[PDB]
Amino acid sequence: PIETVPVKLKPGMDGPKVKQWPLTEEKIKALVEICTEMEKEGKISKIGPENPYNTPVFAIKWRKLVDFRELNKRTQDFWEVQLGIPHPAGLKKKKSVTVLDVGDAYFSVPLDEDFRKYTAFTIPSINNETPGIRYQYNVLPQGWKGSPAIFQSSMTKILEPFKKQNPDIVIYQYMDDLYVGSDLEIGQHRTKIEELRQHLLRWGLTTPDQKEPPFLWMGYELHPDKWTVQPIVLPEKDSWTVNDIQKLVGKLNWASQIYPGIKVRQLSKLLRGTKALTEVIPLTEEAELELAENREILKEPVHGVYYDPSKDLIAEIQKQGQGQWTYQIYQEPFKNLKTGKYARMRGAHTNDVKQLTEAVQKITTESIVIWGKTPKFKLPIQKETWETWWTEYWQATWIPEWEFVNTPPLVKLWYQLEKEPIVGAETFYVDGAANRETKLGKAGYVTNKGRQKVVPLTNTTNQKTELQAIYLALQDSGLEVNIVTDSQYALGIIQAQPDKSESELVNQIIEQLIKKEKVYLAWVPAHKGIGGNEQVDKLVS
Amino acid sequence: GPISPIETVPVKLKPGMDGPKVKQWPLTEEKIKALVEICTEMEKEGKISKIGPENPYNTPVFAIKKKDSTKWRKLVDFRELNKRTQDFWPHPAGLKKKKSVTVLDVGDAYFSVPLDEDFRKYTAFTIPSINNETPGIRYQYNVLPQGWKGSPAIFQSSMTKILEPFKKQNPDIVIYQYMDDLYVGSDLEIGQHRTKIEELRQHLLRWGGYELHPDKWTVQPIVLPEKDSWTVNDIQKLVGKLNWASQIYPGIKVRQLSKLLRGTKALTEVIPLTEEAELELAENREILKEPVHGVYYDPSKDLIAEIQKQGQGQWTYQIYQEPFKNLKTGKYARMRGAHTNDVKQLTEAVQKITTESIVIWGKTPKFKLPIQKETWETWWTEYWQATWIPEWEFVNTPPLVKLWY
Ligand SMILES: [Mg+2]
């Protein structure tokens, strides 16, 4: 009775035509059972040989399983309306809660009549000479490209008149589960529940007989004053088929929105094949470690409490070991709504202040996702340290209103280049050069006091000879030094003001900059008339 | 809603281009509530209609508040759609010289002219929900949407018939239409200005501001710090700066100034200028006053505006079409959020540069912003107060030399 959603194949592409595997006797027998039972329900209709399309069907346990990968490859794209999945920390405390599951979710939302031609499939012919039956779907099939989005849209357009007619209750629908929250007395709440089930039943949507405190909703337990994610169990199997691997990457990419540090990359790499939905697959050792360590991170119990809109959101950040940060979002002290780890250290040069800013912006974004507001921050950095940083940084940067919290290790600025040249300080005109052919080079400096130095270097590049020249200038100078270079590369690296790097030359330059008192770095154009630069250049030439 | 009575124009996208498929970014609870209230009433009035997931296109949507405004206004990020929409078929050069120019929001007028049926699917947008409680509410426009570049082009004739009795009675006033904004400029006194723009406002309401003064817009030229006593560092900074300026003016020379730096001297050592060095410095001083060769406004090419943070709340900017041929240079100071917010000052700088570029050339530039992508994308919507949105790029390379002080 639900109005259908128009569906069209991709432009210039007909329906699928995949040859059906003949199976054994038992599988066929069970398939005829389940398929006839599904033909008693209006889900599928028998078609004559006029239809030239076919979709492979198997039988695992029984359980029917259809391979719609080709049909999905030819079905139009559908816009994913959701920005993610609901987080239980975004739930407001309700006096009455009920979680309903939709029975036969897909199989109760009608499919576009013009599209059913492409849903054709064959039950394999078991033999002396007995026929294979030809069905087409009259409803959304499981595993089809458009079934989730169309089912969600139909569910929304079904629930809207009921949600308007019942403003005292709130309904959050996602996949199998409907969350019905209310502050009404439990009686009126139950009556509204039954009204919702009758409303869904009028449209052909059944919901078989959660009333108990452990409300399982989207893999969560919604206890009265807290919530806990259900531990996700991954299969330990000697041999993996391809359906179980795709199902597993489904539940893993699902579990990505609740757990940090869960990757599906190398497992998803094994989904590029022409093989059918039942063949054995060899498992790469990259996917072995990928499933192992992820199966270990899912052992971490995650818990939290509910959101009170009458209070403000507080987000506290702490520094860890190697580019790692921890954060807690809470409204009352130590009663965290959501905790998490942020893992990013730039593959190029970076500093702790940048990482802290990126953490603030990310937890701000997800905080707007879950609660629609930006939390007040508590960061392990002083006010004057931040003020100096953002006021002196060449790029526009800013973080929202925050307060300093003295939680070691504190975020500090390890060095600060000066704005003006230093009077009385030694001036080092540095330069370096190398030849690609012999992989040999020179790095050196000349000094107004006559000091000079040239070092020959193996395993160095030109842009590495420049940094080596700056490094030699820092080593052989006092605590206050002015350095003049012609390399926009080296000076461009130093101007980013990093405190750690993958290149150990850059890191030793950083330590030399920390141990100094005053460092003024100037730039001059190369191969122009210029005092010391042409001297040190002629040396390194 | 009902089929609009006005006959519809057949619009189409650029050849080979498909519709926009941009994801919706998270919105605050305040803006989501505002967009729900707005879009429900707009759905009741037949301006928008709910759609399903079979529409593969989407366009970001959010809400803004103008300067000194308490009412939320819906702003759809039609940038990609405008980039994919077919160009249609003038900018008054007299507008830049008027003493007072008022900007009025006439986007609501567009809500009276229907949008092409076969084109409506490209105007799809999705209002998100907090914590994804309910799936987002999707709409498509049945009417000319605000922020779409086709709306003023299609509504131009109707606007002309609306403004003719005001345009012939007052032929001195200059009227230019850009997107949802109408710019009315004149050399009149401010008191008469308010009255005449009120006259045109009632004239718009019979069928049913933001004030600027462009003749006071200042440029920021290339100035050389010309002191009396010169240290080595000052002269090498000058030699680098003029060696950079030699790409704009090939007549710049730095020989006699570089000869002063001969030998390896300390950066703070005072250097006396020679005779030909002072002569060459003065010559290079006047060559910077000569106009740049080959510079002119080409409407067929995009405008590019680069912004540089100068500290202490002042920001420099350059508007050009190809490197070193600046149509306008300038600097801003004492903007909103000065000395406490760089993102707000940069946003206001983008808005001011954009308004000026619309007044001068009739088109918005493409911006090179001195900010990380993540920070700007994190906070820029919190301070946007304009009905248009320009495209922008992100610069992550630190400038060796500031060059505009
Ligand atoms: Mg060199």
Helix (H) or strand (E) holding B184: strand B181-186
A143 CB-near residues (< 8 Å, 6+ apart): A65, A66, A67, A68
Class of domain B212-297: alpha beta
Q: Amino acid letter at B251?
A: G
A236 CB-near residues (< 8 Å, 6+ apart): none
Contact A522 B233 (CB under 8 A): yes
Interface test with A, best of B259, B267, B380, B392 (most A CBs within 10 A): B267
A149: chain B residues, CB-CB within 8 Å: 53
Beta-ladder partners of A480: A518
User: Residue A488 Cα, ligand 1 centroid: separation in angstroms?
Assistant: 11
Helices A488-495 and A504-515, packing angle to 10 deg: 60
A254 Cβ under 8 Å from any chain B Cβ: no
Distances (CA, A) of B286 to B98, B218, B260, B318: 31, 20, 21, 21
DSSP string for residues in B320-341: ESSTT-EEEEEEE-S-TTTTT-
User: Residue A533 Cα, ligand 1 centroid: separation in angstroms?
Assistant: 7
User: Residue A349 Cα, ligand 1 centroid: separation in angstroms?
Assistant: 23
Whole-angstrom distance, CA of residue B163 vs CA of residue B176: 11
A482: chain B residues, CB-CB within 8 Å: 233, 266-268
Whole-angstrom distance, CA of residue A441 vs CA of residue A463: 11
Tokens of A67: 């391979």
Mind telling me how many Å the CA of B141 is from chain A's nearest CA? 17
Tokens of A494: 């130093």
Going by DSSP bridges, is the β-strand pair A121-122/A96-101 parallel, antiparallel, or unpaired?
unpaired
For residue A523, give the nearest of B231, B240, B263 by CB distance.
B240
Spatial contact of B248 and B344, defined as CB atoms under 8 Å apart: no
Residues 489-508 of A with CB under 8 A from B: 491-492, 495-496
CATH architecture of B298-405: 2-Layer Sandwich (3.30)
Tokens of B370: 């001195």
Contact B52 A491 (CB under 8 A): no
Q: Amino acid letter at B296?
A: Y
Tokens of B249: 């003016």
- Annotation: binding site of A: 101, 176-177, 431, 466, 486, 537
Whole-angstrom distance, CA of residue B210 vs CA of residue A230: 56
B91 CB-near residues (< 8 Å, 6+ apart): B176, B299, B361, B362, B363
For residue B309, give the nearest of A395, A426, A447 by CB distance.
A395
A450: chain B residues, CB-CB within 8 Å: 264
User: Residue A444 Cα, ligand 1 centroid: separation in angstroms?
Assistant: 10
Whole-angstrom distance, CA of residue A105 vs CA of residue A437: 68
A362 CB-near residues (< 8 Å, 6+ apart): A342, B374
CA dihedral A485, A487, A492, A494 (to 10 degrees): -40
Contact A531 B397 (CB under 8 A): no
Phi, psi of A188 (to 5 degrees): -60, -35
The separation between the first and the last C-alpha atoms of chain B, rounded to the nearest angstrom, is 58
Spatial contact of A227 and B131, defined as CB atoms under 8 Å apart: no
Whole-angstrom distance, CA of residue A30 vs CA of residue A62: 6
Q: Is A199 left (phi over 0), alpha (psi -120 to 50) or beta?
A: alpha
| Of A75, A73, A71, A77, the residue nearest A121 (C-alpha) | A71
Class of domain B94-118+160-211: alpha beta
Q: Where are the beta strands (DSSP E) in B278-391?
A: 304-309, 315-320, 326-332, 366-369
B266: chain A residues, CB-CB within 8 Å: 425-427, 448, 482
Q: Where are the beta strands (DSSP E) in A188-301?
A: 216-217, 220-222, 227-229
* Burial grade of A260 (CB within 10 A; 0-12, 13-18, 19 or more): middle
Query: Do B10-93+119-159 and B94-118+160-211 come out as alike in CATH topology?
Result: no
For residue B379, give the nearest of A90, A398, A427 by CB distance.
A398
Tokens of A525: 């154009």
Mind telling me how many Å the CA of A495 is from chain B's nearest CA? 7
* Burial grade of B272 (CB within 10 A; 0-12, 13-18, 19 or more): exposed
In terms of DSSP H, where are the helices of A323-444? Answer: 352-370, 383-392
Which residue has 């052989």 as its token pair?
A476
Helix (H) or strand (E) holding A332: strand A324-332
DSSP class of residue A265? Answer: H
- For residue A491, what is the nearest residue in chain B, using CA coordinates? B400
Which residue has 């592409």 as its token pair?
A13
A422 Cβ under 8 Å from any chain B Cβ: yes
For residue A397, give the nearest of B132, B342, B398 by CB distance.
B342
Which residue has 């990968």 as its token pair?
A69
* Burial grade of A483 (CB within 10 A; 0-12, 13-18, 19 or more): buried
What sign results for the dihedral spanned by CA atoms A134, A135, A141, A142? negative
Whole-angstrom distance, CA of residue A319 vs CA of residue A381: 10
B278 CB-near residues (< 8 Å, 6+ apart): none
Spatial contact of A480 and A518, defined as CB atoms under 8 Å apart: yes
Give the number of other CB atoms < 10 A from CB of residue A396: 25
Radius of gyration of chain A (CA): 33
A361: chain B residues, CB-CB within 8 Å: 374-375, 378-379
* Burial grade of B365 (CB within 10 A; 0-12, 13-18, 19 or more): buried
User: Residue A416 Cα, ligand 1 centroid: separation in angstroms?
Assistant: 25
Return the domain boundaries, chain B: 10-93+119-159, 94-118+160-211, 212-297, 298-405
Superfamily of domain B10-93+119-159: HIV Type 1 Reverse Transcriptase, subunit A, domain 1 (3.10.10.10)
DSSP class of residue B172? Answer: T
- Annotation: binding site of A for Mg(2+): 101, 176-177, 431, 466, 486, 537
| Of A56, A72, A52, the residue nearest A64 (C-alpha) | A56
Domains within chain A, CATH numbers bracketed: 1-81+107-147 (3.10.10.10), 82-106+148-213 (3.30.70.270), 214-307 (3.30.70.270), 308-414 (3.30.70.270), 415-541 (3.30.420.10)
Pairs from A490-496 (Cβ < 8 Å, separation ≥ 24): A490/A463, A490/A466, A491/A521, A491/A523, A491/B400, A492/B397, A492/B398, A492/B400, A493/A349, A493/A467, A494/A417, A494/A470, A494/A521, A495/A394, A495/A417, A495/A521, A495/B398, A495/B400, A496/A349, A496/A351, A496/B398
In the 3-class helix/strand/coil scheme, how is A382-406 assigned residue by residue?
CHHHHHHHHHHCCCCCCCCCEEECC
Q: How far is CA A119 from the centre of its chain?
A: 33
Spatial contact of B184 and B101, defined as CB atoms under 8 Å apart: yes
What sign results for the dihedral spanned by CA atoms B350, B354, B357, B361? positive
Spatial contact of A203 and A2, defined as CB atoms under 8 Å apart: yes
What sign results for the dihedral spanned by CA atoms B371, B335, B28, B140? negative
Distances (CA, A) of A151 to A106, A175, A202, A527, B158: 6, 8, 16, 69, 44
Pairs from B278-285 (Cβ < 8 Å, separation ≥ 24): B280/B253, B280/B255, B280/B256, B281/B224, B281/B226, B281/B238, B281/B257, B283/B253, B284/B224, B284/B242, B284/B245, B284/B252, B284/B253, B284/B254, B285/B224, B285/B226
- For residue A91, what is the nearest residue in chain B, using CA coordinates? B131
Length of chain A: 541
Spatial contact of B180 and B66, defined as CB atoms under 8 Å apart: no
Q: Where are the beta strands (DSSP E) in A402-490?
A: 402-404, 426-435, 440-447, 452-458, 480-485
Whole-angstrom distance, CA of residue A150 vs CA of residue A538: 73
Tokens of A444: 């050196």
User: Residue B388 Cα, ligand 1 centroid: separation in angstroms?
Assistant: 47
The answer to whether the bond into A409 is cis (omega within 30° of 0) is yes
Whole-angstrom distance, CA of residue A30 vs CA of residue A8: 32
Contact A5 B54 (CB under 8 A): yes
B37 CB-near residues (< 8 Å, 6+ apart): none
Spatial contact of B369 and B395, defined as CB atoms under 8 Å apart: yes
User: Residue A317 Cα, ligand 1 centroid: separation in angstroms?
Assistant: 44
Spatial contact of A124 and A21, defined as CB atoms under 8 Å apart: yes
Tokens of B257: 């100034």
User: Residue A460 Cα, ligand 1 centroid: separation in angstroms?
Assistant: 15
CA dihedral A156, A162, A165, A166 (to 10 degrees): -100
A398 Cβ under 8 Å from any chain B Cβ: yes
Mind telling me how many Å the CA of A462 is from chain B's nearest CA? 19
User: Residue A442 Cα, ligand 1 centroid: separation in angstroms?
Assistant: 11
The structure was resolved experimentally with: X-ray
Whole-angstrom distance, CA of residue A469 vs CA of residue A487: 10
A390 Cβ under 8 Å from any chain B Cβ: yes
Mind telling me how many Å the CA of B133 is from chain A's nearest CA? 5
Q: Amino acid letter at A437?
A: E
Interface test with B, best of A358, A398, A422, A523 (most B CBs within 10 A): A398
Give the number of other CB atoms < 10 A from CB of residue B49: 15
User: Residue B249 Cα, ligand 1 centroid: separation in angstroms?
Assistant: 25
Contact B132 A423 (CB under 8 A): no
Q: Amino acid letter at A90?
A: G
A122 Cβ under 8 Å from any chain B Cβ: no
Whole-angstrom distance, CA of residue B1 vs CA of residue B42: 10
The separation between the first and the last C-alpha atoms of chain A, rounded to the nearest angstrom, is 85
CA dihedral B29, B33, B38, B44 (to 10 degrees): 140
